[PDB]
Amino acid sequence: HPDVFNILLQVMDNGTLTDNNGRKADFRNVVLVMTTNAGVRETERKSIGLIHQDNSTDAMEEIKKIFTPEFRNRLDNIIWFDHLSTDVIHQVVDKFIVELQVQLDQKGVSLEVSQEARNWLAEKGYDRAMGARPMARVIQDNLKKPLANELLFGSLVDGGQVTVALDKEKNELTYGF
Amino acid sequence: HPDVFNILLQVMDNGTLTDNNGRKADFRNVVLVMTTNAGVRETERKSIGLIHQDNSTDAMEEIKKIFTPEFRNRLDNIIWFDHLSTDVIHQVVDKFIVELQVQLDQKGVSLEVSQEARNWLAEKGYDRAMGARPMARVIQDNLKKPLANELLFGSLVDGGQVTVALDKEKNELTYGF
Amino acid sequence: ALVPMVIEQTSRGERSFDIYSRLLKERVIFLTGQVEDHMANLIVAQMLFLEAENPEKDIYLYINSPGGVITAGMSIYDTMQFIKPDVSTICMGQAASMGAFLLTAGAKGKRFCLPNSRVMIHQPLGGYQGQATDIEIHAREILKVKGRMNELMALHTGQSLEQIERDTERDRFLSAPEAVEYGLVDSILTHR
Amino acid sequence: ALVPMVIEQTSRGERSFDIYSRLLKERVIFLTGQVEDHMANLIVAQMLFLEAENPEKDIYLYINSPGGVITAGMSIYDTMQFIKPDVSTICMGQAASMGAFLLTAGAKGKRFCLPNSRVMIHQPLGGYQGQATDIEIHAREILKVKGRMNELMALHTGQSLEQIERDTERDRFLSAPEAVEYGLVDSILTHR
Amino acid sequence: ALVPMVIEQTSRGERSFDIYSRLLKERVIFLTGQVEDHMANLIVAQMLFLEAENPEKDIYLYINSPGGVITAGMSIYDTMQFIKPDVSTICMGQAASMGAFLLTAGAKGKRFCLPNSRVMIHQPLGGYQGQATDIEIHAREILKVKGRMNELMALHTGQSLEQIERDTERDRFLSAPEAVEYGLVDSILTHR
Amino acid sequence: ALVPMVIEQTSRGERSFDIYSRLLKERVIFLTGQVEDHMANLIVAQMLFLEAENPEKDIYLYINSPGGVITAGMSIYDTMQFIKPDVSTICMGQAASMGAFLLTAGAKGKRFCLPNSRVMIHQPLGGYQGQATDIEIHAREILKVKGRMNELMALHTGQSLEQIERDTERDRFLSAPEAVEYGLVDSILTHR
Amino acid sequence: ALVPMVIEQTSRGERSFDIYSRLLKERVIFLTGQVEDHMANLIVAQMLFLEAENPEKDIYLYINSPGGVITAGMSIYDTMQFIKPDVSTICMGQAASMGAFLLTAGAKGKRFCLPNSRVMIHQPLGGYQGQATDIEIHAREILKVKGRMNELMALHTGQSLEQIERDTERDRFLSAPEAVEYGLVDSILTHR
Amino acid sequence: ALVPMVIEQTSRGERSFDIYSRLLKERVIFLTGQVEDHMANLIVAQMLFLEAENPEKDIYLYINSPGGVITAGMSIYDTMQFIKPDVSTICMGQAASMGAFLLTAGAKGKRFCLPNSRVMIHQPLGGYQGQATDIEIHAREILKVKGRMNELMALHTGQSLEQIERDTERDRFLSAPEAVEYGLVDSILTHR
Amino acid sequence: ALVPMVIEQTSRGERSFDIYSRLLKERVIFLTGQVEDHMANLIVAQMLFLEAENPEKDIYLYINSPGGVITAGMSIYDTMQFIKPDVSTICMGQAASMGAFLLTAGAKGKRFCLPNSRVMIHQPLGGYQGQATDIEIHAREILKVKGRMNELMALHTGQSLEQIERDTERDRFLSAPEAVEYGLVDSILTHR
């Protein structure tokens, strides 16, 4: 509720907040980070006309309308995160694959993914609109589901490892032991 | 509030009102009397036009336009209590004068209120829109303020014959004793 | 905004009404300008509407009119004598010709006229082009209307018919006090 | 605000209707002015609408009309005869020509005129320029209409055809008592 | 208030619809006056609207029209044949020229005229000023239309083409029973 | 957008209103342009409406008018005199002819005009064509009106009648300070 | 009811639409009558509006138009080519001149014509009064437009340019099947 | 759709306001086109309305006007001087004649003019037909008005009266920079 | 339903907005038809309104205009230069005369033109009747305007002044590619 923001005026400005017993919270050694999706619904909307408009000034409307001037004027900064680029997606995919590798290592099996397979997953899952969020699903469907069957029903348990590669004809992934 | 109205209809239909403690009030032995002033408000309004017309209405219709038929259909009646006649307002002022005299008798003061004074107070206090309600004030001030003053100042005594003639300008022609 | 809105408090007090509708609600109808069919039909609709709303209350008809079509005026004339509640007519500005005709047709004792208003009366006008045979028919038709109009004036004013017959031969103008003396109206409204 | 608004209570009372709509709700339709196609298409829409609302109740049609197009009048004429509830026609002001035709077409026993109204009847008018061959076609067309108009008048008035035929050769004006005697209407409404 | 409002109850009851919209809701469309492009454009839109609302519920087209532009009328004609539900055409007052054309184009067995309607048919009218070369182009253009209209009349009425051509050489008026015999309509409505 | 809407917060909401209705609530009526019957009829409706709203408060009439029909103006003139609350008339722009007449008719001590306004007074205009007998009647009536207007000017201004008689034979223009000296207005408004 | 209202069952409530707004929601735009600046401007606004609502769905342009101003039509033409969704055009009634021009400009495979509609094409008209040098300038401009229009006709119809030029020197009328063979439209809609 | 609606969030909701009302709310009044009585009357109503809403805040008057009736313009002129808040006038497009007159009448230091706007000043126009005696009266009145306008120009511009007298003999056009030097405006707005 | 309504969901629910208002919200303004005072007065109001809504976003001005009054156009011209956000002008249909003038006045790099649109430029027109002295004054003013317009054209297009001076002697038509080369616009929009 926007009135809850008022609680932070004295926090951001004096590092303090007083509890109902009269004791004071001391935030001088606290880093305050607030996150938001304000302005996104608007920045992602298509305009009507021959020329598409630049809707990057979301900061000028939603952030300003939501946060009272006295709140805003106490911030060190308002930082706009961008949509992730495709270069980033490749890095994101590598990151998620590593997370997968760790979960697999804990079960005594390991996973290798070819570069072609990685590029394919990255290319398949990219959606500028949803950032890095869907990449975890692309990995979930292309790597984790196959693996769960191999891990759960004996194909890939103790004694083996799995290598995943992309073919070119179908651009389908391989698996193994 | 409409939920008073709704609970009254529920009582009219089943004879009971249920308490927070599960206790039930039994209305089979009671008489419900409701009052309303709706039928007297419309009649006191002046019409727009060179000729004012008669805005007398049917009070029963005014009720019809305010109250629901579910309510009306659960009544034994809707009764019009009319305005008061001259002799009635005299009965009312005389009752007030007698009560005044009782207070004066407790002190021992005899107050003679002329018939002209009695008629006038009844006429002045009475308001056909508010009936006899204002009579309390025409007598409370006109027949008492001067007595309180002569008694408290000490010009009037516990006893004595004090009279109030009314003059042609309708003034209280009070006396000492 | 040719016609302003007014706001009236009631129970909810949300209603706004063109000032003319606000006055219709008080049983006030305004007849202005030429009497024609569309206007008259609207006045008749208003009178029938008020008769239905409350048959027991007077309807006030404000007249400020130079005259008009007799036929159209007669639909007002007859509605006024048909509907149950009295129609009280008030002349302001002018009531000429058919306008005067309707003014005197109000309920007896309730025909009023503001003091600087003018009332004018005169035999009906008309005309026709055609064969001598058709001319005769139409001439007979206007004379009957004249005669009928003369009979109704005498009825409503108390003047003898012969006197009405003479007085409408040529335009006759009456000041508000003259309208009262003549019998077109009962009285003059002056100040509230 | 040419046409005033009226307020009617219901339950909530949230009803504001132009006076014309308010009276339609009381099953009153006004037919006024020249009878043409757009107007005599609204009269029909209203009658069909009222028939559906309650097939068992009368519809009151107020007529104040100088005449008009026969064709347009016939869509009204046929709708009145087709639908179930009686249409009671009331003459105010005038019912001339096509207007008189529709007046007599109301339900038997329910046709009436206010006392100072005027009803006028007469054979149809028309015309046509073109080749002698086309003139004959169009002349034949108007005579068939005249004949058809005469049959329907005789049907509704009770006059013989021969008599109704003679009486419409030239404009014939009838006073309200004459309309009753003749049979165009059944009675005169006087006072409510 | 040229067009009255009607109130209809539902669940909550908050429905106030112009009387013509009230009738559109019942699948009734009115074609009146001259056939032109804006009118035709609106009728087509209404028919498509009704077709979608319920593809299996007749649409009633009330016709009272002197004629109009063929081109505009053909967009009504084509829409009526295109759309799935039957369009039942009713002739009231008149259906002349293009109006007659559309009347006969209604669904077979569902075409009918009130007892006093007139239906009139006749070859297309037109014209053109310009150079003899342009006159020739436009003259051929109108003759093709005439031929095309003649084929459609024959198709819908059941008359042979030669007969339908002879009969439209000059204006031909048909009374309601004549229209039935000719085949312009299937029947005559009489009384509820 | 010819007339802009304004909003005001009172109890539970904004209530937008045509700026002209917003001012009617403040008991401000504007009279502008020609004085005619429909305009005058509306001003009277507004004054009666305000009188009922609160009989004890002044009504401000803003006048900016070149003149107009005397009859229509007298309708306004008499209502102002009849109704209980004072009508305070303010002249802005111009008050000519009948406009000046109404300006002086406001409540004494409350008649005022802006510094650069102009007030113009003159005897009434009119005319008639017809038989010498009718000319005589109509000429006599306009003279009675002139006399009547002359008396009312003298009454409201304090001028002798003869002085008014002389001053209005030909158009007379008065600057705001002259209107004050003459007695048409009581004062000049300057700055708040 | 110049334009009927309809109501729609969706989720939150029926609201109401005036047919054309109702059809705009279905991505149907109607182009009728003469093409001029204001109407063209409105169509462009509607197409931009629909393009934004859903860039992946076709827009249907119903055409029934005699022609119009090329410039105005040119703004429609360019918007149709610019916007992402295909614009499917349907010719009903007529598509003449500029109307025909826009008809063929719809997405290939989606140009439809109803069976009895007529399409007419011709070179542009214009004119100018002034000095011989001013005439020279304007003559060149109209010729450039003619050339430009022929280039676009050839592009959209598949006819050679040489053939388009010959075929538009004089008005050319095409019936729906002729338009298909010529290539102005792709197919004829018949029955659903 | 001549004037678009705009929506602005307020407190408990948002409100849709004709763009012209949306700007009145910001204390912006637009004076455009000829100055006449009805338009002037509306500007006066707007200024009085704004004065009451906040007597301590400036009112902006945007002028784009060729001139008009002096009388009507003076009512605007006097209201601007009477009301408490400063009226800041801005000339855009043109301010000619009476428009120029009102432009210079704004609050000193707040009279602004856009860079390409033109201001034009000239003695008043008028005329009269009648008897030599009436001509004489009317000629004197126009001359008094001329003198009066000359006095107000000198007052507001700082020019001597003699200089104003010479400069308005014939139309004198001033570019925005010339208006500043002359003293009609205080400054030129350029870019925000 | 001349202008369709569109509906969009926002926060609390859906809002119905004339399609023209729906586009104003997208910062799209249409300038079509003749440039005159009332039209300019409205465009300026819209631009001021959008500037306030969000000073940092572009305003799109769609132009399809044959020309108009220079004065009115200059108020648009000055507002565009004054307000902070860029105004991006797009030419569709035509931008002639004053329309072309405003087209080039858009923000540099943002002047766009659809491919089949025409842009036409010429020296200003005008005229005057009167005494030789007045003729000189008015001739002097139109020439100053011509000079002034010539400077602004050179400023915005990058052409030398002398070249602009020569090129506007007589109407010059430019195709969209020519407008780009000349410098009236920056680029041509083709397909999305």
mmCIF file with all atom_site columns, N, CA and C in Angstrom, chain C residues 2 4-7 9 12-13 19-20 32 93-94 114 116 118 170-171 173 190-192, chain F residues 12 15 17 21 38 41-42 45 49 51 71 74 77-78 81-82 131 134 137-138 141 148:
data_model
loop_
_atom_site.group_PDB
_atom_site.id
_atom_site.type_symbol
_atom_site.label_atom_id
_atom_site.label_alt_id
_atom_site.label_comp_id
_atom_site.label_asym_id
_atom_site.label_entity_id
_atom_site.label_seq_id
_atom_site.pdbx_PDB_ins_code
_atom_site.Cartn_x
_atom_site.Cartn_y
_atom_site.Cartn_z
_atom_site.occupancy
_atom_site.B_iso_or_equiv
_atom_site.pdbx_formal_charge
_atom_site.auth_seq_id
_atom_site.auth_comp_id
_atom_site.auth_asym_id
_atom_site.auth_atom_id
_atom_site.pdbx_PDB_model_num
ATOM 1   N N  . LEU C 1 2   ? -28.106 26.596 -24.467 1.00 0.00 ? 2   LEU C N  1
ATOM 2   C CA . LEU C 1 2   ? -29.137 27.584 -24.726 1.00 0.00 ? 2   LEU C CA 1
ATOM 3   C C  . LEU C 1 2   ? -30.132 27.574 -23.614 1.00 0.00 ? 2   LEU C C  1
ATOM 4   N N  . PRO C 1 4   ? -30.360 26.450 -19.719 1.00 0.00 ? 4   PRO C N  1
ATOM 5   C CA . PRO C 1 4   ? -29.557 26.090 -18.590 1.00 0.00 ? 4   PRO C CA 1
ATOM 6   C C  . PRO C 1 4   ? -30.190 24.981 -17.829 1.00 0.00 ? 4   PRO C C  1
ATOM 7   N N  . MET C 1 5   ? -29.371 24.261 -17.095 1.00 0.00 ? 5   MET C N  1
ATOM 8   C CA . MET C 1 5   ? -29.795 23.200 -16.224 1.00 0.00 ? 5   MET C CA 1
ATOM 9   C C  . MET C 1 5   ? -29.951 23.718 -14.840 1.00 0.00 ? 5   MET C C  1
ATOM 10  N N  . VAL C 1 6   ? -30.853 23.147 -14.095 1.00 0.00 ? 6   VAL C N  1
ATOM 11  C CA . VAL C 1 6   ? -30.984 23.479 -12.706 1.00 0.00 ? 6   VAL C CA 1
ATOM 12  C C  . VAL C 1 6   ? -30.893 22.209 -11.912 1.00 0.00 ? 6   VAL C C  1
ATOM 13  N N  . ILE C 1 7   ? -30.509 22.310 -10.658 1.00 0.00 ? 7   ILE C N  1
ATOM 14  C CA . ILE C 1 7   ? -30.379 21.145 -9.794  1.00 0.00 ? 7   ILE C CA 1
ATOM 15  C C  . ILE C 1 7   ? -31.356 21.218 -8.676  1.00 0.00 ? 7   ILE C C  1
ATOM 16  N N  . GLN C 1 9   ? -32.840 19.412 -4.963  1.00 0.00 ? 9   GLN C N  1
ATOM 17  C CA . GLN C 1 9   ? -32.634 18.409 -3.950  1.00 0.00 ? 9   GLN C CA 1
ATOM 18  C C  . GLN C 1 9   ? -33.930 17.720 -3.684  1.00 0.00 ? 9   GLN C C  1
ATOM 19  N N  . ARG C 1 12  ? -32.417 12.029 -2.705  1.00 0.00 ? 12  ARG C N  1
ATOM 20  C CA . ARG C 1 12  ? -31.078 11.685 -3.154  1.00 0.00 ? 12  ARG C CA 1
ATOM 21  C C  . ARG C 1 12  ? -30.484 12.994 -3.645  1.00 0.00 ? 12  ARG C C  1
ATOM 22  N N  . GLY C 1 13  ? -31.325 13.775 -4.319  1.00 0.00 ? 13  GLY C N  1
ATOM 23  C CA . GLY C 1 13  ? -30.950 15.089 -4.834  1.00 0.00 ? 13  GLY C CA 1
ATOM 24  C C  . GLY C 1 13  ? -30.024 15.065 -6.042  1.00 0.00 ? 13  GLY C C  1
ATOM 25  N N  . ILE C 1 19  ? -34.164 23.855 -17.411 1.00 0.00 ? 19  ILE C N  1
ATOM 26  C CA . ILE C 1 19  ? -35.083 24.654 -16.650 1.00 0.00 ? 19  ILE C CA 1
ATOM 27  C C  . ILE C 1 19  ? -36.530 24.497 -17.106 1.00 0.00 ? 19  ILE C C  1
ATOM 28  N N  . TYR C 1 20  ? -36.801 24.217 -18.368 1.00 0.00 ? 20  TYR C N  1
ATOM 29  C CA . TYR C 1 20  ? -38.189 24.058 -18.743 1.00 0.00 ? 20  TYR C CA 1
ATOM 30  C C  . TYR C 1 20  ? -38.783 22.779 -18.206 1.00 0.00 ? 20  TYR C C  1
ATOM 31  N N  . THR C 1 32  ? -45.266 29.774 -26.291 1.00 0.00 ? 32  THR C N  1
ATOM 32  C CA . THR C 1 32  ? -44.724 30.992 -26.837 1.00 0.00 ? 32  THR C CA 1
ATOM 33  C C  . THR C 1 32  ? -44.541 30.926 -28.310 1.00 0.00 ? 32  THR C C  1
ATOM 34  N N  . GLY C 1 93  ? -46.277 39.519 -21.728 1.00 0.00 ? 93  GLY C N  1
ATOM 35  C CA . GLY C 1 93  ? -45.890 39.797 -23.088 1.00 0.00 ? 93  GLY C CA 1
ATOM 36  C C  . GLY C 1 93  ? -47.199 40.013 -23.817 1.00 0.00 ? 93  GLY C C  1
ATOM 37  N N  . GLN C 1 94  ? -47.528 39.176 -24.780 1.00 0.00 ? 94  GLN C N  1
ATOM 38  C CA . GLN C 1 94  ? -48.777 39.373 -25.485 1.00 0.00 ? 94  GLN C CA 1
ATOM 39  C C  . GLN C 1 94  ? -49.578 38.125 -25.656 1.00 0.00 ? 94  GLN C C  1
ATOM 40  N N  . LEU C 1 114 ? -50.438 39.900 -16.600 1.00 0.00 ? 114 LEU C N  1
ATOM 41  C CA . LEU C 1 114 ? -49.490 40.824 -15.982 1.00 0.00 ? 114 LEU C CA 1
ATOM 42  C C  . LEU C 1 114 ? -49.813 42.212 -16.496 1.00 0.00 ? 114 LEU C C  1
ATOM 43  N N  . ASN C 1 116 ? -48.492 44.953 -17.836 1.00 0.00 ? 116 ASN C N  1
ATOM 44  C CA . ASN C 1 116 ? -48.100 45.686 -19.018 1.00 0.00 ? 116 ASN C CA 1
ATOM 45  C C  . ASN C 1 116 ? -48.242 44.887 -20.264 1.00 0.00 ? 116 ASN C C  1
ATOM 46  N N  . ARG C 1 118 ? -50.320 42.908 -23.397 1.00 0.00 ? 118 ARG C N  1
ATOM 47  C CA . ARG C 1 118 ? -51.340 43.276 -24.359 1.00 0.00 ? 118 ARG C CA 1
ATOM 48  C C  . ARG C 1 118 ? -52.061 42.111 -24.890 1.00 0.00 ? 118 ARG C C  1
ATOM 49  N N  . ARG C 1 170 ? -62.305 44.213 -36.571 1.00 0.00 ? 170 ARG C N  1
ATOM 50  C CA . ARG C 1 170 ? -61.009 44.782 -36.854 1.00 0.00 ? 170 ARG C CA 1
ATOM 51  C C  . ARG C 1 170 ? -60.151 44.491 -35.666 1.00 0.00 ? 170 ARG C C  1
ATOM 52  N N  . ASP C 1 171 ? -58.864 44.443 -35.829 1.00 0.00 ? 171 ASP C N  1
ATOM 53  C CA . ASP C 1 171 ? -58.011 44.184 -34.699 1.00 0.00 ? 171 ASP C CA 1
ATOM 54  C C  . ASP C 1 171 ? -58.323 45.094 -33.552 1.00 0.00 ? 171 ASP C C  1
ATOM 55  N N  . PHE C 1 173 ? -57.092 46.099 -29.711 1.00 0.00 ? 173 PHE C N  1
ATOM 56  C CA . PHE C 1 173 ? -56.075 45.935 -28.701 1.00 0.00 ? 173 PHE C CA 1
ATOM 57  C C  . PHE C 1 173 ? -56.590 46.334 -27.354 1.00 0.00 ? 173 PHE C C  1
ATOM 58  N N  . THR C 1 190 ? -49.883 41.588 -9.865  1.00 0.00 ? 190 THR C N  1
ATOM 59  C CA . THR C 1 190 ? -49.034 42.762 -9.786  1.00 0.00 ? 190 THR C CA 1
ATOM 60  C C  . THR C 1 190 ? -47.752 42.448 -9.107  1.00 0.00 ? 190 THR C C  1
ATOM 61  N N  . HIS C 1 191 ? -47.819 42.232 -7.822  1.00 0.00 ? 191 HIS C N  1
ATOM 62  C CA . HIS C 1 191 ? -46.644 41.879 -7.076  1.00 0.00 ? 191 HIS C CA 1
ATOM 63  C C  . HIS C 1 191 ? -46.946 40.692 -6.240  1.00 0.00 ? 191 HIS C C  1
ATOM 64  N N  . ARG C 1 192 ? -45.936 39.866 -5.992  1.00 0.00 ? 192 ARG C N  1
ATOM 65  C CA . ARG C 1 192 ? -46.109 38.665 -5.182  1.00 0.00 ? 192 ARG C CA 1
ATOM 66  C C  . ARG C 1 192 ? -46.729 38.998 -3.829  1.00 0.00 ? 192 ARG C C  1
ATOM 67  N N  . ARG F 1 12  ? -20.842 15.429 -1.962  1.00 0.00 ? 12  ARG F N  1
ATOM 68  C CA . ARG F 1 12  ? -20.251 14.182 -2.388  1.00 0.00 ? 12  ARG F CA 1
ATOM 69  C C  . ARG F 1 12  ? -19.612 14.199 -3.773  1.00 0.00 ? 12  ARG F C  1
ATOM 70  N N  . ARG F 1 15  ? -20.213 17.395 -9.894  1.00 0.00 ? 15  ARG F N  1
ATOM 71  C CA . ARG F 1 15  ? -21.301 17.955 -10.681 1.00 0.00 ? 15  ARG F CA 1
ATOM 72  C C  . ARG F 1 15  ? -20.849 18.873 -11.805 1.00 0.00 ? 15  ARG F C  1
ATOM 73  N N  . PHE F 1 17  ? -21.051 21.363 -14.846 1.00 0.00 ? 17  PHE F N  1
ATOM 74  C CA . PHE F 1 17  ? -22.170 22.134 -15.374 1.00 0.00 ? 17  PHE F CA 1
ATOM 75  C C  . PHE F 1 17  ? -21.725 23.119 -16.446 1.00 0.00 ? 17  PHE F C  1
ATOM 76  N N  . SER F 1 21  ? -24.839 27.343 -16.457 1.00 0.00 ? 21  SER F N  1
ATOM 77  C CA . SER F 1 21  ? -25.689 26.779 -15.437 1.00 0.00 ? 21  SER F CA 1
ATOM 78  C C  . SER F 1 21  ? -24.982 26.962 -14.121 1.00 0.00 ? 21  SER F C  1
ATOM 79  N N  . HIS F 1 38  ? -38.326 33.997 -27.601 1.00 0.00 ? 38  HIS F N  1
ATOM 80  C CA . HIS F 1 38  ? -37.824 32.786 -26.997 1.00 0.00 ? 38  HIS F CA 1
ATOM 81  C C  . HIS F 1 38  ? -36.793 33.099 -25.968 1.00 0.00 ? 38  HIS F C  1
ATOM 82  N N  . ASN F 1 41  ? -38.607 34.451 -22.956 1.00 0.00 ? 41  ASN F N  1
ATOM 83  C CA . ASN F 1 41  ? -39.322 33.369 -22.304 1.00 0.00 ? 41  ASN F CA 1
ATOM 84  C C  . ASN F 1 41  ? -38.388 32.573 -21.401 1.00 0.00 ? 41  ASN F C  1
ATOM 85  N N  . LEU F 1 42  ? -37.133 32.430 -21.821 1.00 0.00 ? 42  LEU F N  1
ATOM 86  C CA . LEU F 1 42  ? -36.192 31.707 -21.034 1.00 0.00 ? 42  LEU F CA 1
ATOM 87  C C  . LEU F 1 42  ? -35.739 32.529 -19.857 1.00 0.00 ? 42  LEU F C  1
ATOM 88  N N  . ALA F 1 45  ? -38.290 32.247 -17.255 1.00 0.00 ? 45  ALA F N  1
ATOM 89  C CA . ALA F 1 45  ? -38.229 30.985 -16.557 1.00 0.00 ? 45  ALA F CA 1
ATOM 90  C C  . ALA F 1 45  ? -37.110 30.991 -15.543 1.00 0.00 ? 45  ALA F C  1
ATOM 91  N N  . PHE F 1 49  ? -37.559 30.642 -11.443 1.00 0.00 ? 49  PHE F N  1
ATOM 92  C CA . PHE F 1 49  ? -36.810 29.553 -10.838 1.00 0.00 ? 49  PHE F CA 1
ATOM 93  C C  . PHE F 1 49  ? -35.954 30.025 -9.668  1.00 0.00 ? 49  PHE F C  1
ATOM 94  N N  . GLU F 1 51  ? -36.416 32.818 -7.927  1.00 0.00 ? 51  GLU F N  1
ATOM 95  C CA . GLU F 1 51  ? -37.294 33.366 -6.904  1.00 0.00 ? 51  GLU F CA 1
ATOM 96  C C  . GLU F 1 51  ? -37.737 32.257 -5.955  1.00 0.00 ? 51  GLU F C  1
ATOM 97  N N  . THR F 1 71  ? -42.726 43.761 -26.785 1.00 0.00 ? 71  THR F N  1
ATOM 98  C CA . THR F 1 71  ? -43.531 42.806 -26.094 1.00 0.00 ? 71  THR F CA 1
ATOM 99  C C  . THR F 1 71  ? -42.695 41.798 -25.356 1.00 0.00 ? 71  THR F C  1
ATOM 100 N N  . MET F 1 74  ? -41.346 43.284 -22.330 1.00 0.00 ? 74  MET F N  1
ATOM 101 C CA . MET F 1 74  ? -42.256 43.547 -21.239 1.00 0.00 ? 74  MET F CA 1
ATOM 102 C C  . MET F 1 74  ? -42.506 42.287 -20.468 1.00 0.00 ? 74  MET F C  1
ATOM 103 N N  . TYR F 1 77  ? -39.853 42.559 -18.146 1.00 0.00 ? 77  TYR F N  1
ATOM 104 C CA . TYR F 1 77  ? -40.119 43.718 -17.303 1.00 0.00 ? 77  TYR F CA 1
ATOM 105 C C  . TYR F 1 77  ? -41.110 43.431 -16.185 1.00 0.00 ? 77  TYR F C  1
ATOM 106 N N  . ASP F 1 78  ? -42.210 42.757 -16.510 1.00 0.00 ? 78  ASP F N  1
ATOM 107 C CA . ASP F 1 78  ? -43.191 42.466 -15.510 1.00 0.00 ? 78  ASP F CA 1
ATOM 108 C C  . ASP F 1 78  ? -42.757 41.393 -14.578 1.00 0.00 ? 78  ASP F C  1
ATOM 109 N N  . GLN F 1 81  ? -40.707 42.935 -11.883 1.00 0.00 ? 81  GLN F N  1
ATOM 110 C CA . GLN F 1 81  ? -41.432 43.699 -10.903 1.00 0.00 ? 81  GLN F CA 1
ATOM 111 C C  . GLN F 1 81  ? -42.255 42.812 -9.988  1.00 0.00 ? 81  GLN F C  1
ATOM 112 N N  . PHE F 1 82  ? -42.804 41.743 -10.527 1.00 0.00 ? 82  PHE F N  1
ATOM 113 C CA . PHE F 1 82  ? -43.637 40.847 -9.764  1.00 0.00 ? 82  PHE F CA 1
ATOM 114 C C  . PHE F 1 82  ? -42.906 40.063 -8.694  1.00 0.00 ? 82  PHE F C  1
ATOM 115 N N  . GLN F 1 131 ? -55.413 48.618 -44.908 1.00 0.00 ? 131 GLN F N  1
ATOM 116 C CA . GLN F 1 131 ? -56.394 49.646 -45.190 1.00 0.00 ? 131 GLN F CA 1
ATOM 117 C C  . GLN F 1 131 ? -56.218 50.796 -44.267 1.00 0.00 ? 131 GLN F C  1
ATOM 118 N N  . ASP F 1 134 ? -57.167 50.145 -40.768 1.00 0.00 ? 134 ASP F N  1
ATOM 119 C CA . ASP F 1 134 ? -56.325 49.334 -39.935 1.00 0.00 ? 134 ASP F CA 1
ATOM 120 C C  . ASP F 1 134 ? -55.103 50.108 -39.597 1.00 0.00 ? 134 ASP F C  1
ATOM 121 N N  . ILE F 1 137 ? -55.775 52.002 -36.596 1.00 0.00 ? 137 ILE F N  1
ATOM 122 C CA . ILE F 1 137 ? -55.779 51.206 -35.389 1.00 0.00 ? 137 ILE F CA 1
ATOM 123 C C  . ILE F 1 137 ? -54.401 50.882 -34.940 1.00 0.00 ? 137 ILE F C  1
ATOM 124 N N  . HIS F 1 138 ? -53.563 50.477 -35.847 1.00 0.00 ? 138 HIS F N  1
ATOM 125 C CA . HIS F 1 138 ? -52.232 50.115 -35.466 1.00 0.00 ? 138 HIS F CA 1
ATOM 126 C C  . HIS F 1 138 ? -51.407 51.313 -35.101 1.00 0.00 ? 138 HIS F C  1
ATOM 127 N N  . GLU F 1 141 ? -52.254 52.157 -31.580 1.00 0.00 ? 141 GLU F N  1
ATOM 128 C CA . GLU F 1 141 ? -51.662 51.283 -30.608 1.00 0.00 ? 141 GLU F CA 1
ATOM 129 C C  . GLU F 1 141 ? -50.199 51.551 -30.413 1.00 0.00 ? 141 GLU F C  1
ATOM 130 N N  . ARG F 1 148 ? -46.844 54.563 -22.839 1.00 0.00 ? 148 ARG F N  1
ATOM 131 C CA . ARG F 1 148 ? -46.626 53.646 -21.729 1.00 0.00 ? 148 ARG F CA 1
ATOM 132 C C  . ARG F 1 148 ? -45.144 53.477 -21.394 1.00 0.00 ? 148 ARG F C  1
#
